Design a protein that fits this description.
Subcellular location (chain F): Cytoplasm; Nucleus
Main location (chain F): cytoplasm
Strand content of chain F: 5-15%
CATH class of chain G: Alpha Beta
Structural class of chain F: alpha+beta
Number of strands of chain F: 8
Helix content of chain G: 25-40%
Number of helices of chain F: 6
Largest interface: C-H, 33 and 40 residues
Shape of chain G: globular
CATH topology of chain G: Glutamine Phosphoribosylpyrophosphate, subunit 1, domain 1
Strand content of chain G: 15-25%
Chains: A alpha+beta (250), B alpha+beta (201), C alpha+beta (220), D alpha+beta (213), E alpha+beta (199), F alpha+beta (239), G alpha+beta (233), H alpha+beta (204), I alpha+beta (228)
Largest sheet of chain G: 5 strands, antiparallel
Structural class of chain G: alpha+beta
CATH architecture of chain G: 4-Layer Sandwich
Oligomer: part of a larger assembly
Family (chain F): Belongs to the peptidase T1A family.
Largest sheet of chain F: 4 strands, antiparallel
GO molecular function (chain F): identical protein binding
Number of helices of chain G: 6
Keywords (chain F): Acetylation, Cytoplasm, Glycoprotein, Host-virus interaction, Nucleus, Phosphoprotein, Proteasome
Chain lengths: 250, 201, 220, 213, 199, 239, 233, 204, 228
């Protein structure tokens, strides 16, 4: 049975992980998300590869999956492949509330899920998770935090992210947008609108194909504002007037 | 059955009677309750005879293995702690161990009293055994804390004598060792019958 | 707690008391001990509730994996052997004291469930604390079931016999008509026991009680 | 309920001389008034230099003895040498203790030649605590032995008596008189007496007849 | 068998432990200390079976020492008391159950120091004081007389002097040595030992 | 086609997954370190910080205890595994026998655990290494290393990564026996290797110094900012 | 490596695509057409069963195997591994029914089954399910129609179709079926899109139309199938 | 007894459009008090509470273990928690140990998430569900709970008469009987707002 | 044509065991010597860079108080066998009240010589030199990674095992004193080392019944060096 084993777990002769390098090629494709710094709140946006309009869209949050009433995670990858990790981390977040009675911080929440994806890479020859999802939340210590997961079992957590393919023109623009935080929660969402409008393949900033979920820090409820797509269109046309105002300079 | 151990300026003095009897029948006067674990350590026997023999010898396992690996003498506090945890797994099964961990440590003289119930404590003085309190009255009245090595010999053996005088259980011979920085050294072993006229005047 | 029933030609009628007493004070005045086994099978509860409830739910769950294997409609011989099988596997650590009945293709059949797992096939069975009063009516007055209706009265005659005799079964009478085509469950059937009226108005008006701390939490 | 432990009788006395040792045990196996068999020697020789006695529950006697004989070949086929006299009592200490929860009921006394070519006696107990002794007496008749043995062999209970260690002979009849005196009030001892003498030239055995009632 | 003082103040925490390890009649270890220091803001108190107090000290002490350098901050007294409960809750139904008595003491820089109560049945409660012994009847006199918890940092130590005079009244025991500690935002501080004269 | 073996190993005289894992070591982030009678200094670079992200998530140094410091070179994936692993190891060690074993228990833990990690089937060897930092009892320094084969070894100097970081250890050998008698020059060695190692950005450079038994703290851009200015001045004093 | 207990056989292509899982979609494409429509009051399913020989009677083998009294379902492609997950879903739907005491919605059947179905694909040594399940039923007063795939991804479609030429029948269900219609009108266009790839002969045994009522699922006998479709659509 | 160890009484009374639940604030071992600020009834979900009478461990154990399975159901399905779903959620938890079951008298009284219609239920320590159409009382002494309320509770009771009826009911029981006392908290919830009042009780 | 590595190849014998022998080429060598007076053993640490600390890597470890040992090839490979063998001799002194002498250690390691396997794991390529003093006096034994224990009075390992033993087998005639073999070993040592002999290069293993333990001492290691 040594010839039938393809040596998934075992490394490549080149020093790279043979299974992980072909894994992250799917992350560069498929899922598309973004993140940015914002004061007194945090925003998340994603574009669906299911964006074809024949769907019912009765799932409400789909690519936006909400793990807890106080926490949401934007997923990039295969749905059901991620759904195994969702309820898992959901129970890890819930078992934390059980022995503690206090919200799970974001730091150890990411390191707990990344090790689950790492266990299949290190042994067992099992199929590693090709799902890379973001993290948002708030704690009494470090406050607002952003994180990212990697298929190799590492946390890709930073204060910014590029996922997974497009947004290119906005990527380098985000480095010029690197000015840290603001609100006016509608102003930071306005910056996210020029990202979705300019860098989309069909452009036009289709409202039904994208969904924006924002977490507003509130004591002690921490209200998460999930936009109903009725106020997204006015948020889309909000910065489209600003984008038309931005081109008045030149 | 009378055992006593106490620490002072020089090492630790350990003394116990050699008589082991069942009920009113005399069995053996040569039973040695003082057990030698390591050249720098001394064990004791109380309650169950083989229980102090097994666990102190099983303690010597982790103690000698630690001396083979790290090439360093294990502390008396670690030996007393590692012994309390192993016996605690068997707690409630009927085992009774009244041993008193003795020896030398890098910090200085030390004494530890471990029981099968899981007691872990240091201390200046400990005395455990059969019927006692008649001996406690004459002992604690003349017993002091900080004295010399020569005065510790006759004073520690005095408690065994007066005990065996009134108490018909304790008896036999008195095994007295003296712990020092280089390890324990055998002092003397004498029968209580010969020690009668010595401490009586 | 009393459960009894008799079998007629085309079906069975089961009944039980609604009074469930814990200790010297009545706990649940209105209680239904008839549990759903399957569409055509019903069983009467008794003894420990949570033990028999989780039992009959696991039974019915196993019967949902049992009768549905070939589909058709649930026979009792499927549920019959499972009781003596499973309840004996635990050697009687739990308890049942149940009345099992159902209408199959072979015709209606009744059973008496015991905590040790022994089940016997009888046209009439009585279990519970009032089993002595329900048996005296079924035993001596038994008849070969003839037409339907007269046996429906025989159950109500035996069920009411245990209510008026045994003080353990009060409150309301229950009757469930189980036949091949027709299935009827009527609860409560009759309320022989009543409670006396209040001697007056004991309501306590506001103003006579002080509150240490008050809280108002409006909702959405 | 069922009692796994019972006392089948027997008395073991082993006196070890300077350069050799002697082992003595009665052969009467009896429970109650009835006698199982009149000749049932309790002295079992593991090696040429070591002879062990067994007392108490008879089922555990043959079991524990045959287990040691099974462990003898384990060590003999490992280090290519027989177990030392001190190792037999030491290994038995680990065996009796491993069973501490459900231990054998046995009274064993080992005697014979050590690695120094001298006699040694090892007192055993169901908890597996042993030590090297000059002479020890087991069984139920030890109540009349140790007080008398210390009066004779131990030179106790006397004044102005020098200490001369014994060797052979008289220790024989010392086992005879204590059994005839015990045979009166106690029926667990009598019939034939098997006494083993462990010497450098081999093992010598002798049979002593006693009253049957 | 013994009760360690349970004063819980708004800005402070006061605990007083007896140093007598003696059993039966004659005294064995006079200098023994039952006080264990969990973190800078949290202490540990345990009484019960000998081996039970040793290992229950371990599991409670060491798990908080781990969370310290893990996320970079100290555990909260609320989350700590719940963690200790699970060890006590799982000890309820277990192959080898164990027994515990005393409670936990901790400090917080935001909501303030909190005092919980550990019980051998794992039942917990939030109380400014508790009773581990019969001495509660004599303490509730001066206490319930003036119950206002505005006073004070060092007055609780002065109030402990009044309790120390009321600890020995009708009893047969002695307990000459009492060790006391005090908790503030800077951590646990050492206090002087107590000595009762015989005559 | 693809013809290769795994474990173990090959008649050619060298192992496969072991010495090849050393390539995953040398390719790790550039890091250095030194030992001293009082203050021990370390360093890390080549993190490729874009200035736009958070520095605390890329931190390469953790601490099991205030006495012993952790420094590793390699991917950060297996890091938290070992972080969770080793912290529980030094925890259970803290639990029973309060006085810990000195420096020979912990250095042989990860080393032997990694050795048996190449032993049993279904276990893929780690391609990362580590070097223990801290101070031995009675004022002595302690440092060791981890090897893909599990061999623990103590170095007078820590040189890994590219060839530019090997010069930092070369400069330590130029201080001979006496130097340094002030902690100022010992910290400045990291500020001098900041120009030599990596891209010389003044950003990815991070260090912490533990003086005697005092627990170290991460250097804030004040002390290390003042010692960075004297590093260029001290090099100008040699001209 | 390790045992030989069937470690995962599924690897990643250089582009990151699944190897044997995408090949299971070919069995769905090489299977039989199955259609379903979510409109208004309830969901309507139209499957296709045609006998390869005149000796086959469709009265025995039933394509529609409802999971619950209120929950219907159909499938596409490949049987042998289909009945494994069916009966597995019968045992799995009981935990939600016993603990939570409630007629478990189709959305929870989707979350639990597709998670195990994804775990089944992750487990090697076994061929992944080549069955695309259409999950429907009525819950909370509003019914649902959900489509799964061999990879486990779950979608939601008003009117969906699977099997041979599923992209062509999907456009017909996009045009001819829109907004929502009554169950009677839903059966109409469900047979019309099934008659697309169907042969020139349509009888009671050739097509079977399941429907999920708000009152719960009711499987229609071949009688009502020949009455409404004769004269198909 | 086991339930009389910590004592305590949970009285939940349903009104017309609302529902009320009450429990004493006394926490103590046997007859010796410990603290009066202990909380027994805990909030579960939205506009739903649960009464608990028994060992204070099973009060904290179940409520925390229930909070565990509470969210996990709500996080999978965004819809609410329902009093029926949470009812058997405790029954499955109390049935985890058949011969080892926890000792508690859980009383779950909460509003329907769909409509203002209140619902009341009480479960046995072994997990046996039980429902009443009037009120559910669980406590040490059952004579004062069943005797009074049967002559007090009425089919239609507004929040004004509902709170004042149980008020004097607890005043007459505590000032006379022994076991309970040391304050009583009352939770009266309706569709528009949540009201929580604490009744006055003897301090001895 | 690699089948299972355990499968008894066409020649045939185990692959990995045949491979593990070549694993000695990547590590240093030692020289054993035995004499009626005592057993002396020498080694070379193979210092690549001055950064290497001499006491960090030691090729001689003492399994039992009177029983020394020497490793080969890698370090941590023997470390699992070394440390676990110390538990063996200690339990033997618990049951029999006597420590294993030079023999029961061999059969203890000989039983575990090959424990490896794929199903039901990887054999170590470290050769072991077993020294000690039994009831027969000073003795030195040797074993190989293949698992077959053969008694070798004076044995050398490493890549120099070929050359170092060739001249060593001639000088083992019983008419040679222990003192003559001590200086005979350093002659082969200075030939097999490229770096000049210094305090950090080599160490010595000497065990005698009278002088002990010893083990070995410090600053007496440097005396045999300057005498080169």
């Amino acid at each position: 049975s040594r010839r039938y084993d393809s040596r998934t777990t075992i490394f490549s002769p080149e020093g790279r992980l043979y299974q992980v390098e072909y894994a992250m090629e799917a992350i560069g494709h498929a899922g598309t998300c973004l993140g940015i710094l914002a004061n007194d709140g945090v925003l998340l946006a994603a574009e669906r590869r299911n964006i074809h309009k024949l769907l019912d869209e009765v799932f409400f949050s789909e690519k936006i999956y909400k793990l807890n009433e106080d926490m949401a995670c934007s997923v990039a990858g295969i749905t059901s492949d991620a759904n195994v990790l969702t309820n898992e981390l959901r129970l890890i977040a819930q078992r934390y509330l059980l022995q503690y009675q206090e919200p799970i911080p974001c730091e150890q929440l990411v390191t707990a899920l990344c090790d689950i994806k790492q266990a299949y890479t290190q042994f067992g020859g099992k199929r590693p998770f090709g799902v890379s999802l973001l993290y948002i939340g708030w704690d009494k210590h470090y406050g607002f935090q952003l994180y990212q997961s990697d298929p190799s079992g590492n946390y890709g957590g930073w204060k910014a992210t590029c996922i997974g393919n497009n947004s290119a023109a906005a990527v380098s623009m985000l480095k010029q947008d690197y000015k840290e935080g603001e609100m006016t929660l509608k102003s930071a969402l306005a910056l996210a609108i020029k990202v979705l409008n300019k860098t989309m393949d069909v452009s036009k900033l289709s409202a039904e194909k994208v969904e924006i979920a924002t977490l507003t820090r509130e004591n002690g409820k921490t209200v998460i504002r999930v936009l109903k797509q009725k106020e997204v269109e006015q948020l889309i046309k909000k910065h489209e007037e600003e984008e038309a105002k931005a081109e008045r300079e030149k | 059955t009378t055992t006593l151990a106490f620490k002072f300026r020089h090492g630790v003095i350990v003394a116990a009677d050699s008589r082991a009897t069942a009920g009113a029948y005399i069995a053996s006067q040569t039973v040695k309750k003082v057990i030698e674990i390591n050249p720098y350590l001394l064990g004791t026997m109380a309650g169950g005879a083989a229980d102090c023999s097994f666990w102190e010898r099983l303690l010597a396992r982790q103690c000698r293995i630690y001396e083979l690996r790290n090439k360093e003498r294990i502390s008396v506090a670690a030996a007393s702690k590692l012994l309390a945890n192993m016996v605690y797994q068997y707690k409630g099964m009927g085992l009774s161990m009244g041993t008193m961990i003795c020896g030398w440590d890098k910090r200085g003289p030390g004494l530890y009293y471990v029981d099968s119930e899981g007691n872990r404590i240091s201390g200046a003085t400990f005395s455990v055994g059969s019927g006692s309190v008649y001996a406690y009255g004459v002992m604690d009245r003349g017993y002091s804390y900080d004295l010399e090595v020569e005065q510790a010999y006759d004073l520690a053996r005095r408690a065994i004598y007066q005990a065996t005088y009134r108490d018909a259980y304790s008896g036999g011979a008195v095994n007295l060792y003296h712990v020092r920085e280089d390890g324990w050294i055998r002092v003397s072993s004498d029968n209580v019958a010969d020690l009668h006229e010595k401490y009586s005047g | 707690t009393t459960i009894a029933g008799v079998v007629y030609k085309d079906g069975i009628v089961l009944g039980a008391d609604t009074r469930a007493t814990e200790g010297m004070v009545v706990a649940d005045k209105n209680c239904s001990k008839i549990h759903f086994i399957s569409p055509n099978i019903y069983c009467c509860g008794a003894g420990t509730a949570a033990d028999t409830d989780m039992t009959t739910q696991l039974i019915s769950s196993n019967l949902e994996l049992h009768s549905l294997s070939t589909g058709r409609l649930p026979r009792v011989v499927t549920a019959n052997r499972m009781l003596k099988q499973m309840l004996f596997r635990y050697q009687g650590y739990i308890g049942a004291a149940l009345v099992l009945g159902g209408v199959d293709v072979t015709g209606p059949h009744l059973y008496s469930i015991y905590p040790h797992g022994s089940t016997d096939k009888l046209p009439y069975v009585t279990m519970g604390s009032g089993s002595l009063a329900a048996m005296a009516v079924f035993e001596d007055k038994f008849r070969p079931d003839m037409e339907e209706e007269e046996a429906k009265n025989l159950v109500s005659e035996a069920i009411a016999a245990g209510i008026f005799n045994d003080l353990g079964s009060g409150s309301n009478i229950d009757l469930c008509v189980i036949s091949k085509n027709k299935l009827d469950f009527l609860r409560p059937y009759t309320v022989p026991n009543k409670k006396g009226t209040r001697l007056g108005r004991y309501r306590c008006e506001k103003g006579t009680t002080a509150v240490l701390t008050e809280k108002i939490t409006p909702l959405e | 309920r069922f009692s796994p432990y019972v006392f089948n009788g027997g008395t073991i006395l082993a006196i070890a001389g300077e350069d050799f040792a002697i082992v003595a045990s009665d052969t009467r196996l009896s429970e109650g008034f009835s006698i199982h068999t009149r000749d049932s020697p309790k002295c079992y020789k593991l090696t040429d230099k070591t002879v062990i006695g067994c007392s108490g529950f008879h089922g555990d006697c043959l079991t524990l003895t045959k287990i040691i004989e099974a462990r003898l070949k384990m060590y003999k086929h490992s280090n290519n040498k027989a177990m030392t006299t001190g190792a037999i009592a030491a290994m038995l200490s680990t065996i009796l203790y491993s069973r501490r929860f459900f231990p054998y009921y046995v009274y064993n006394i080992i005697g014979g030649l050590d690695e120094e070519g001298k006699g040694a006696v090892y007192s055993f107990d169901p908890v597996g605590s042993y030590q090297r002794d000059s002479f020890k007496a087991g069984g139920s008749a030890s109540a009349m032995l140790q007080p008398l043995l210390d009066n004779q062999v131990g030179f106790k209970n006397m004044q102005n008596v020098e200490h001369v260690p014994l060797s052979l002979d008289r220790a024989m009849r010392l086992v005879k008189d204590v059994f005839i005196s015990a045979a009166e009030r106690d029926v667990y001892t009598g019939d034939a007496l098997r006494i083993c003498i462990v010497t450098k030239e081999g093992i010598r055995e002798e049979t002593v007849s006693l009253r049957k009632d | 068998m013994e009760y360690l003082i349970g004063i819980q103040g708004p800005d402070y925490v006061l605990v007083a432990s007896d140093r007598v390890a003696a059993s039966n009649i004659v005294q064995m270890k006079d200098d023994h200390d039952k006080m264990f220091k969990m973190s800078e803001k949290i202490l540990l108190l345990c009484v019960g079976e000998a081996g039970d107090t040793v290992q229950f000290a371990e599991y409670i002490q060491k798990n908080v020492q781990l969370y310290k350098m893990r996320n970079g901050y100290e555990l909260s007294p609320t989350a700590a008391a719940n963690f200790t409960r699970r060890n006590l809750a799982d000890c309820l139904r277990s192959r080898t159950p164990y027994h515990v008595n005393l409670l936990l003491a901790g400090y917080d820089e935001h909501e303030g120091p909190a005092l919980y109560y550990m019980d051998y049945l794992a039942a917990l409660a939030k109380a400014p004081f508790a009773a581990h012994g019969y001495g509660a009847f004599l303490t509730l006199s001066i206490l319930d007389r003036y119950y206002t918890p505005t006073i004070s940092r060092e007055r609780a130590v002065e109030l402990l002097r009044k309790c120390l005079e009321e600890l020995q009244k009708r009893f047969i025991l002695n307990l000459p040595t009492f060790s006391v500690r005090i908790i503030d935002k800077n951590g646990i501080h050492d206090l002087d030992n107590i000595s009762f004269p015989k005559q | 086609s693809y013809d290769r073996a795994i474990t173990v190993f090959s008649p050619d005289g060298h192992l496969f997954q072991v010495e090849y894992a050393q390539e995953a070591v040398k390719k790790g982030s550039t890091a250095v370190g030194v030992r001293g009678r009082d203050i021990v200094v370390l360093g890390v670079e080549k993190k490729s910080v874009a200035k736009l992200q958070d520095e605390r998530t890329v931190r390469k140094i953790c601490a099991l205890d205030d006495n012993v410091c952790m420094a590793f070179a390699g991917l950060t994936a297996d890091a938290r595994i070992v972080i969770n692993r080793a912290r529980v190891e030094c925890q259970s060690h803290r639990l029973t026998v309060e006085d810990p074993v000195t420096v020979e228990y912990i250095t042989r833990y990860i080393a032997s655990l990694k050795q048996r990690y190449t032993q049993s089937n279904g276990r893929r060897p780690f391609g990362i290494s580590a070097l223990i930092v801290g101070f031995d009892f009675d004022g002595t320094p302690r440092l060791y290393q981890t090897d893909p084969s599990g061999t623990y070894h103590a170095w007078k100097a820590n040189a890994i990564g590219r060839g530019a970081k090997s010069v930092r250890e070369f400069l330590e050998k130029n201080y001979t026996d006496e130097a340094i008698e002030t902690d100022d020059l010992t910290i400045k060695l990291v500020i001098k290797a900041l120009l030599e190692v990596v891209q010389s950005g003044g950003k990815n450079i991070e260090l912490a110094v533990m003086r005697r038994d005092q627990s170290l703290k991460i250097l804030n851009p004040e002390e290390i900012e003042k010692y960075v200015a004297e590093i260029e001045k001290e090099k100008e004093e040699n001209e | 490596a390790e045992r030989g207990y069937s470690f995962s056989l599924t690897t990643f292509s250089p582009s990151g695509k699944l190897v044997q899982i995408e090949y299971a979609l070919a069995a769905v494409a090489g299977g039989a057409p199955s259609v379903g429509i979510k409109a208004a009051n309830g969901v309507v399913l139209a499957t296709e069963k045609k006998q390869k020989s005149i000796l086959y009677d469709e009265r025995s083998v039933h394509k529609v195997e409802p999971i619950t009294k209120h929950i219907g379902l159909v499938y596409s492609g490949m049987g042998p591994d289909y009945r494994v997950l069916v009966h597995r879903a019968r045992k799995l739907a009981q935990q939600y029914y016993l603990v939570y005491q409630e007629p478990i919605p189709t959305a929870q059947l989707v979350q639990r089954v597709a998670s195990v179905m994804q775990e089944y694909t992750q487990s090697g040594g076994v061929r992944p399910f080549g069955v695309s399940l259409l999950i429907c039923g009525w819950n909370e007063g509003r019914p649902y129609l959900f489509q799964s795939d061999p990879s486990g991804a779950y979608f939601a479609w008003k009117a969906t179709a699977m099997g041979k030429n599923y992209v062509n029948g999907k456009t017909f269900l996009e045009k001819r079926y829109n907004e929502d219609l009554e169950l009677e009108d839903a059966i109409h266009t469900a047979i019309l899109t099934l008659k697309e790839s169907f042969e020139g002969q349509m009888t009671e045994d050739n097509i079977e139309v399941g429907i999920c009522n708000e009152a719960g699922f009711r499987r229609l006998t071949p009688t009502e199938v020949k009455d409404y479709l004769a004269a198909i659509a | 007894s086991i339930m009389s160890y910590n004592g305590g009484a949970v009285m939940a009374m349903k009104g017309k459009n609302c529902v009320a639940i009450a429990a004493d604030r006394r926490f103590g071992i046997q007859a010796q008090m410990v603290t009066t600020d202990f909380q027994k009834i805990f909030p579960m979900g939205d506009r739903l509470y649960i009464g608990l009478a028994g060992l204070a461990t099973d009060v904290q154990t179940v409520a925390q273990r229930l909070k565990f399975r509470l969210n996990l159901y709500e996080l999978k399905e965004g819809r609410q928690i329902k009093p029926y779903t949470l009812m058997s959620m405790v029954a499955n938890l109390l049935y985890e140990k058949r011969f080892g079951p926890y000792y508690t008298e859980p009383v779950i009284a909460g509003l329907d998430p769909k409509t203002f219609k209140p619902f009341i239920c009480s479960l046995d320590l072994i997990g046996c569900p039980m429902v009443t159409d009037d009120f559910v009382v669980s406590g040490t002494c059952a004579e004062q709970m069943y005797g009074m309320c049967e002559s007090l509770w009425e089919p239609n009771m507004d929040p004004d008469h509902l709170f004042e009826t149980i008020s004097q009911a607890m005043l007459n029981a505590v000032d006379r009987d022994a076991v309970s006392g040391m304050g009583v908290i009352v939770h009266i919830i309706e569709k528009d707002k949540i009201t929580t009042r604490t009744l006055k009780a003897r301090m001895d | 044509y690699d089948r299972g590595v355990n499968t008894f190849s066409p020649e045939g014998r185990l692959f990995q065991v045949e491979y593990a022998i070549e694993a000695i080429k990547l590590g240093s060598t030692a020289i054993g010597i035995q004499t009626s007076e005592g057993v002396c053993l020498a080694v070379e640490k193979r210092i690549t860079s001055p950064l290497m600390e001499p006491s960090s890597i030691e090729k001689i470890v003492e399994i039992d108080a009177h029983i020394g040992c020497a490793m080969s090839g890698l370090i941590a490979d023997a470390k699992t066998l070394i440390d676990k063998a110390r538990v063996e001799t200690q339990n033997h002194w618990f049951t029999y009240n006597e420590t294993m002498t030079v023999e029961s250690v061999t059969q203890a390691v000989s039983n575990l010589a090959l424990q490896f396997g794929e199903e039901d794991s990887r054999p170590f390529g470290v050769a072991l030199l077993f020294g000690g003093v039994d009831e027969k006096g000073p003795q030195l034994f040797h074993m190989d990674p293949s698992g077959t224990f053969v008694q070798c009075d004076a044995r050398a390992i490493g890549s120099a095992s070929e050359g170092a033993q060739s001249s060593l087998q001639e000088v083992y005639h019983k008419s040679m004193t222990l003192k003559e073999a001590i200086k005979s070993s350093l002659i082969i040592l200075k030939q097999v080392m490229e770096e000049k002999l210094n305090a950090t290069n080599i160490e010595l293993a000497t065990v005698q019944p009278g002088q002990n333990f010893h083990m070995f001492t410090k600053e007496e290691l440097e005396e045999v060096i300057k005498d080169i």
